[PDB]
Design a protein around this ligand. Sequence first.
Ligand SMILES: [Co+2]
Length: 215
Amino acid sequence: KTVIKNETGTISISQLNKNVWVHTELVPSNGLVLNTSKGLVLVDSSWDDKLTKELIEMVEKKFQKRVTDVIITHAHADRIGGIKTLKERGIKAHSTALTAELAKKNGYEEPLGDLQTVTNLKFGNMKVETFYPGKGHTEDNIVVWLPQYNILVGGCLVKSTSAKDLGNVADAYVNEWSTSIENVLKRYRNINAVVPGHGEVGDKGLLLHTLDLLK
Ligand SMILES: [Co+2]
């Protein structure tokens, strides 16, 4: 897989696919860059505004298209933190209503609150499904599915192999997280890659790992 870094090793993009890339910023945090016929779409932005601006500028320059949309997978900072940058640049920031409600409560600018339990979006030819599986890492966590690739973005709901515990559980629902993981396994029975919130890309084994960490 082709991999491209900025000057610092602070931001790195790894090609999963002709049109799907994983972005990682330095903990490392992951999201996706979707190279579509109508622009770039990000699944998650970055830790804060400084890194979000750098991420956008890197990908706009490389791919020679604008970032048009971001999907925010929960209302914590590794996730909501670049919202000011998105809003001021006219980048549409999609989220569930609950994620937007939580962002506002916590003093962040609000994403759109447009995503339902299951939402199907199309960006050029790129199909994206968002799914709220229930509570887990947070109340509001969603996953994102690319049905043309059978790629799942697990976000913080899904732990990497290298994670040997659940991490920050202060906002977690450790008794509903296993059911939520089961909901993802039931919906998506044939998965090619799973992108955890943090750590190396894997497959359905990451979901099984997360289940074991919850015991
Ligand atoms: Co989080």
